[PDB]
């Protein structure tokens, strides 16, 4: 009962899934208005097809595109790349930290209708329904960012669809988001505190993992080992971020881990050549988790059925509507 | 002599009575397609727009310049559909207003110049519809990004001959900073309209810009929140100045010899989502005439005050014709 861009699929059809990915990290209407920024729309489709086929050959069967309205989600692009690559792509709703005036002047009740429109009816005029809700917070929650967290909760409770968040982990936003989700009546088993790998703090993660929250260790290839790339991605290495997966397995929270790359095939919501800077830091792309992180954990003393539990059974339990 | 409309190129003589600053929808990038239910439905918005433009046409309007940019949620397909059904020429816009998303605000002046050029020379999105005007904006002192938008607009105008029109916080005298930046790029004042100029009563500011060759946009004549001072949202947007006060600025500029520098419009819309929810209903109640307000209520008002019919015809037909013509 998991909604994808090609239609509804079952829990067994999901397989190896990456919980936090992006085909394109852009802005609302941007891809349609300026496709030449990515070379052409043809070039972005071709680069995304080759990148997903690389992930499929590596073991991945499903990717969850957490690109929201304001990240410039184009479900028609998501459907085209999914068809040519034979990889299941799950679409998303919600609002990130770049909402336009028509979204930021809306009440909590109006934002619930929009989220409920994209999950129950469909996205735009395509009929494609959203299977996950993406929300954001950069530091302490602004008066509007609180309404998005609450609206995402009211939409998750009426459909059963899960929530995934953006967090500035060094500032520990996951505790405030958790306090807001719990005040709304949302079950912690339906929420994923993303970007939790941006910190080396383990005491903040185990506290949330004990309450039932899923920990999103999603930006593993993000290593700044360029003032723009050093501020966006990486103070530490990938080995340090991948050791945080092992540190949570050792504490007995193997059922709460969700791994991903947080990769893109086109990036426009930052500096011009950030995609070219990223493409060489990680030449593996979206295939970094099964080819470089899984054999690392196998060498550092973690069995294959613990890793096959994190990648197959954990995201399938998360993405299933309850 | 030839200008781009959403139905294709037309000869300037066919433009006729032209409203220089209007919107079919005041929204945000991708909003109409992602949430048409905000406006009832996409079909309801089209029907309302067609009815409004048909009524405006019956009153004498032949062309409107939709100054909706990418970030005002310009949907050219909607503009084309309504233009064809109402049989009113609609000139589309490029440029950037004051709500650009991350992918726009992180761009350099060279990249923004290429985006504006693409929308004028090649087309908007995958439609083939080309922009006939560049819309820019400042709300007080220009931010570093707004300065880049103004420079890119000036560069695209110099390369194509297409005019530039602006949004200003008129009380803050924004037109002076805008003018300075445009002229630093070598753009002729005759290719620029300093809009929302009816938001101020400072005639010294207006005549000085007009004296330099700038077109003065007295473009929101029906905007008045008198009678509804209890509505904090409507008062902050529409202001407390009467439609008459805004319209008398057209007479004031004519009297000082600047009839050739005046552009008049309503700054109306059929859908409004970039503000509070009830705003379109409130606006439609204050002004039931919509875009027809200029020929039905403003033109006869100025005739009562003594302005000749040939001067008014010069402001509504000749001035927009000279402005829109690629020069
Ligand atoms: Co993020
Ligand atoms: Co992301
Ligand atoms: Co304006
Ligand atoms: Co306007």
From Swiss-Prot, chain A:
Zn(2+) 1 binds at residues 20, 22, 134, 262. Its main location: membrane. One of its GO terms (molecular function) is aryldialkylphosphatase activity. Has attracted interest because of its potential use in the detoxification of chemical waste and warfare agents and its ability to degrade agricultural pesticides such as parathion. Binds 2 Zn(2+) ions per subunit. CDD domains: PTE. Its EC number is 3.1.8.1. One of its GO terms (biological process) is catabolic process. PROSITE patterns: PHOSPHOTRIESTERASE_1, PHOSPHOTRIESTERASE_2, TAT. The modification N6-carboxylysine is found at residue 134. Keywords: Cell membrane, Hydrolase, Membrane, Metal-binding, Plasmid, Signal, Zinc. It is found in: Cell membrane. GO terms for cellular component: plasma membrane. Predicted to be exported by the Tat system. The position of the signal peptide cleavage has been experimentally proven. This is Parathion hydrolase. It comes from Brevundimonas diminuta (Pseudomonas diminuta).
């Amino acid at each position: 009962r998991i909604n994808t861009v090609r239609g509804p699929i079952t829990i067994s059809e999901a397989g190896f899934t990456l919980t936090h990915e992006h085909i394109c990290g852009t802005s609302a209407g941007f891809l349609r208005a300026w496709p030449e920024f990515f070379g052409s729309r043809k070039a972005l489709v071709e680069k995304a097809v080759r990148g997903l086929r690389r992930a499929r050959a590596a073991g991945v069967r499903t990717i969850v595109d957490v690109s929201t309205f304001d990240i410039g989600r184009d479900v028609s692009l998501l459907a085209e790349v999914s068809r040519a690559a034979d990889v299941h792509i799950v679409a998303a709703t919600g609002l990130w930290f770049d909402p336009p005036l028509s979204m930021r002047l809306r009440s909590v009740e109006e934002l619930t209708q929009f989220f409920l429109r994209e999950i129950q009816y469909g996205i735009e005029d395509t009929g494609i329904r959203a299977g996950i809700i993406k929300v954001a917070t950069t530091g302490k929650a602004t008066p509007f960012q609180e309404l998005v967290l609450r609206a995402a909760a009211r939409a998750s409770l009426a459909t059963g669809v899960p929530v995934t968040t953006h967090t500035a982990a060094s500032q520990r936003d996951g505790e405030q988001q958790a306090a807001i989700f719990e005040s709304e009546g949302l079950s912690p088993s339906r929420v994923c505190i993303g970007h939790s790998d941006d910190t080396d703090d383990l005491s903040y993660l185990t506290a949330l993992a004990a309450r039932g929250y899923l920990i999103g260790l999603d930006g593993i290839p993000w290593s700044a080992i360029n003032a723009s790339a050093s501020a966006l991605l990486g103070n530490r290495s990938w080995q340090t971020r991948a050791l945080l997966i092992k540190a949570l397995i050792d504490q007995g929270y193997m059922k709460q881990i969700l791994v991903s790359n947080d990769w893109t095939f086109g990036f426009s919501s930052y500096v011009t050549n950030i995609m070219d800077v990223m493409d060489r830091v990680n030449p593996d792309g979206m295939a970094f988790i099964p080819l470089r992180v899984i054999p690392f954990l196998r060498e550092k003393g973690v069995p294959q059925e613990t890793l096959a539990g994190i990648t197959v059974t954990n995201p399938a339990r998360f993405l299933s509507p309850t």
